[PDB]
Design a protein around this motif. Structure first.
Motif, PDB file in Angstrom:
ATOM      1  N   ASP A  47       0.827  -1.203   0.000  1.00  0.00           N
ATOM      2  CA  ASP A  47       0.000   0.000   0.000  1.00  0.00           C
ATOM      3  C   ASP A  47       0.862   1.255   0.000  1.00  0.00           C
ATOM      4  N   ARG A  48       1.813   1.335   0.927  1.00  0.00           N
ATOM      5  CA  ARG A  48       2.781   2.420   0.924  1.00  0.00           C
ATOM      6  C   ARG A  48       3.943   2.150  -0.019  1.00  0.00           C
ATOM      7  N   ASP A  49       4.048   0.927  -0.544  1.00  0.00           N
ATOM      8  CA  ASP A  49       5.176   0.513  -1.380  1.00  0.00           C
ATOM      9  C   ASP A  49       6.500   0.783  -0.675  1.00  0.00           C
TER      10      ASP A  49
ATOM     11  N   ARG B  33      -2.926   6.437  -4.203  1.00  0.00           N
ATOM     12  CA  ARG B  33      -1.837   5.559  -3.790  1.00  0.00           C
ATOM     13  C   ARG B  33      -0.648   5.699  -4.732  1.00  0.00           C
ATOM     14  N   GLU B  36       1.091   8.917  -3.842  1.00  0.00           N
ATOM     15  CA  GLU B  36       1.881   8.686  -2.639  1.00  0.00           C
ATOM     16  C   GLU B  36       3.173   7.947  -2.966  1.00  0.00           C
ATOM     17  N   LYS B  37       3.087   6.894  -3.779  1.00  0.00           N
ATOM     18  CA  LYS B  37       4.289   6.175  -4.177  1.00  0.00           C
ATOM     19  C   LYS B  37       5.082   6.922  -5.238  1.00  0.00           C
ATOM     20  N   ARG B  39       5.375  10.125  -4.392  1.00  0.00           N
ATOM     21  CA  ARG B  39       5.863  11.049  -3.369  1.00  0.00           C
ATOM     22  C   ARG B  39       5.714  12.503  -3.819  1.00  0.00           C
ATOM     23  N   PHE B  40       4.463  12.918  -3.960  1.00  0.00           N
ATOM     24  CA  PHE B  40       4.128  14.296  -4.277  1.00  0.00           C
ATOM     25  C   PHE B  40       3.631  15.007  -3.024  1.00  0.00           C
ATOM     26  N   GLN B  41       4.084  16.247  -2.841  1.00  0.00           N
ATOM     27  CA  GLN B  41       3.667  17.024  -1.679  1.00  0.00           C
ATOM     28  C   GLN B  41       2.202  17.419  -1.788  1.00  0.00           C
TER      29      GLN B  41
ATOM     30  N   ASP C  45      11.334  17.117  -1.749  1.00  0.00           N
ATOM     31  CA  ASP C  45       9.947  17.042  -1.308  1.00  0.00           C
ATOM     32  C   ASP C  45       9.224  18.377  -1.418  1.00  0.00           C
ATOM     33  N   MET C  46       9.933  19.451  -1.757  1.00  0.00           N
ATOM     34  CA  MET C  46       9.402  20.806  -1.682  1.00  0.00           C
ATOM     35  C   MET C  46       9.520  21.421  -3.071  1.00  0.00           C
ATOM     36  N   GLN C  47       8.470  21.284  -3.873  1.00  0.00           N
ATOM     37  CA  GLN C  47       8.566  21.659  -5.272  1.00  0.00           C
ATOM     38  C   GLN C  47       8.729  23.170  -5.423  1.00  0.00           C
TER      39      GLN C  47
END
Lengths: 49, 48, 48
Positions: A47-49, B33, B36-37, B39-41, C45-47
Protein backbone atom coordinates in the motif's frame (compact mmCIF):
# COMPACT_ATOMS: atom_id res chain seq x y z
CA UNK A 1 6.61 6.12 7.71
CA UNK A 2 7.06 3.90 10.78
CA UNK A 3 10.63 2.94 11.68
CA UNK A 4 12.79 2.08 14.66
CA UNK A 5 10.66 -0.78 15.99
CA UNK A 6 12.36 -3.46 18.07
CA UNK A 7 11.68 -7.01 19.22
CA UNK A 8 13.17 -8.89 22.16
CA UNK A 9 12.81 -12.56 23.08
CA UNK A 10 13.90 -15.20 25.54
CA UNK A 11 14.25 -18.84 24.69
CA UNK A 12 16.06 -21.57 26.54
CA UNK A 13 19.41 -22.65 25.11
CA UNK A 14 18.87 -24.46 21.82
CA UNK A 15 15.07 -24.09 21.78
CA UNK A 16 14.86 -23.28 18.08
CA UNK A 17 14.41 -19.58 18.82
CA UNK A 18 17.11 -18.73 16.28
CA UNK A 19 15.48 -21.12 13.81
CA UNK A 20 12.11 -19.41 14.18
CA UNK A 21 13.61 -15.94 13.95
CA UNK A 22 15.64 -16.81 10.86
CA UNK A 23 12.58 -18.41 9.26
CA UNK A 24 10.65 -15.17 9.77
CA UNK A 25 12.75 -13.35 7.17
CA UNK A 26 13.19 -16.53 5.10
CA UNK A 27 16.76 -17.61 5.85
CA UNK A 28 17.08 -21.30 6.69
CA UNK A 29 19.40 -20.69 9.65
CA UNK A 30 21.52 -17.91 11.10
CA UNK A 31 24.28 -18.46 13.66
CA UNK A 32 23.75 -20.20 17.01
CA UNK A 33 26.08 -18.25 19.27
CA UNK A 34 26.46 -16.99 22.84
CA UNK A 35 25.22 -13.72 24.27
CA UNK A 36 22.83 -11.28 22.66
CA UNK A 37 22.41 -11.80 18.92
CA UNK A 38 20.96 -9.55 16.24
CA UNK A 39 18.84 -10.09 13.13
CA UNK A 40 16.30 -8.43 10.81
CA UNK A 41 12.67 -8.20 9.90
CA UNK A 42 12.33 -6.97 6.32
CA UNK A 43 8.74 -5.71 6.42
CA UNK A 44 7.31 -4.63 3.06
CA UNK A 45 3.97 -2.88 2.56
CA UNK A 46 2.51 -2.71 -0.94
CA UNK A 47 0.00 0.00 0.00
CA UNK A 48 2.78 2.42 0.92
CA UNK A 49 5.18 0.51 -1.38
CA UNK B 1 -47.37 12.38 -2.44
CA UNK B 2 -45.78 14.81 -4.91
CA UNK B 3 -42.93 15.43 -2.47
CA UNK B 4 -42.45 11.69 -1.98
CA UNK B 5 -42.43 10.99 -5.71
CA UNK B 6 -39.94 13.82 -6.26
CA UNK B 7 -37.73 12.31 -3.57
CA UNK B 8 -37.90 8.82 -5.04
CA UNK B 9 -37.25 10.00 -8.59
CA UNK B 10 -34.26 12.00 -7.34
CA UNK B 11 -32.86 8.95 -5.56
CA UNK B 12 -33.45 6.68 -8.56
CA UNK B 13 -31.58 9.25 -10.65
CA UNK B 14 -28.82 8.94 -8.05
CA UNK B 15 -28.92 5.15 -8.44
CA UNK B 16 -27.30 5.15 -11.88
CA UNK B 17 -24.61 7.62 -10.79
CA UNK B 18 -23.87 5.39 -7.77
CA UNK B 19 -21.84 2.95 -9.87
CA UNK B 20 -19.98 5.68 -11.79
CA UNK B 21 -19.16 7.26 -8.45
CA UNK B 22 -17.96 3.90 -7.12
CA UNK B 23 -15.60 3.46 -10.06
CA UNK B 24 -14.49 7.06 -9.50
CA UNK B 25 -13.73 6.14 -5.89
CA UNK B 26 -11.73 3.10 -7.00
CA UNK B 27 -9.76 4.93 -9.68
CA UNK B 28 -9.02 7.73 -7.23
CA UNK B 29 -7.87 5.21 -4.63
CA UNK B 30 -5.49 3.93 -7.30
CA UNK B 31 -4.42 7.45 -8.24
CA UNK B 32 -3.90 8.63 -4.66
CA UNK B 33 -1.84 5.56 -3.79
CA UNK B 34 0.16 6.08 -6.99
CA UNK B 35 0.74 9.73 -6.12
CA UNK B 36 1.88 8.69 -2.64
CA UNK B 37 4.29 6.17 -4.18
CA UNK B 38 5.32 8.96 -6.54
CA UNK B 39 5.86 11.05 -3.37
CA UNK B 40 4.13 14.30 -4.28
CA UNK B 41 3.67 17.02 -1.68
CA UNK B 42 -0.07 17.04 -1.07
CA UNK B 43 -1.12 20.68 -0.55
CA UNK B 44 -2.59 21.72 2.81
CA UNK B 45 -5.87 22.31 0.96
CA UNK B 46 -5.85 18.68 -0.22
CA UNK B 47 -8.88 16.78 1.06
CA UNK B 48 -7.97 13.25 2.10
CA UNK C 1 32.98 -28.44 22.00
CA UNK C 2 33.50 -26.00 24.82
CA UNK C 3 30.90 -23.22 25.12
CA UNK C 4 31.25 -21.92 28.66
CA UNK C 5 34.12 -19.41 28.47
CA UNK C 6 31.80 -16.43 28.88
CA UNK C 7 30.91 -17.70 32.36
CA UNK C 8 34.61 -18.58 32.77
CA UNK C 9 35.37 -14.90 32.27
CA UNK C 10 38.05 -13.72 34.75
CA UNK C 11 36.67 -10.15 34.75
CA UNK C 12 32.98 -10.99 34.36
CA UNK C 13 30.58 -9.83 31.64
CA UNK C 14 32.14 -6.34 31.66
CA UNK C 15 34.83 -7.40 29.19
CA UNK C 16 32.03 -8.62 26.93
CA UNK C 17 29.75 -5.67 27.62
CA UNK C 18 32.31 -2.98 26.79
CA UNK C 19 32.89 -4.79 23.50
CA UNK C 20 29.16 -4.74 22.76
CA UNK C 21 29.14 -1.15 24.05
CA UNK C 22 31.53 0.03 21.34
CA UNK C 23 28.84 -1.07 18.88
CA UNK C 24 26.46 1.76 19.66
CA UNK C 25 29.40 4.00 19.82
CA UNK C 26 30.19 3.49 16.16
CA UNK C 27 26.77 2.90 14.65
CA UNK C 28 25.20 5.69 16.67
CA UNK C 29 27.67 8.26 15.39
CA UNK C 30 27.19 6.72 11.95
CA UNK C 31 23.44 7.29 11.93
CA UNK C 32 23.95 10.70 13.52
CA UNK C 33 26.44 11.60 10.80
CA UNK C 34 23.95 10.24 8.27
CA UNK C 35 20.88 11.93 9.69
CA UNK C 36 21.55 15.62 9.03
CA UNK C 37 23.15 14.69 5.71
CA UNK C 38 20.11 12.60 4.77
CA UNK C 39 18.08 15.69 5.66
CA UNK C 40 19.07 17.18 2.30
CA UNK C 41 16.60 14.86 0.54
CA UNK C 42 13.84 17.12 1.86
CA UNK C 43 14.85 19.63 -0.82
CA UNK C 44 13.09 17.47 -3.41
CA UNK C 45 9.95 17.04 -1.31
CA UNK C 46 9.40 20.81 -1.68
CA UNK C 47 8.57 21.66 -5.27
CA UNK C 48 9.40 24.99 -6.89
Amino acid sequence: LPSGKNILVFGEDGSGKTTLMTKLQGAEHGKKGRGLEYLYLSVHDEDRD
Amino acid sequence: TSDAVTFITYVQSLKRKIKQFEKQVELYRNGQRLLEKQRFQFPPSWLY
Amino acid sequence: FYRNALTRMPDGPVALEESYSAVMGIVSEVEQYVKVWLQYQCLWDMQA
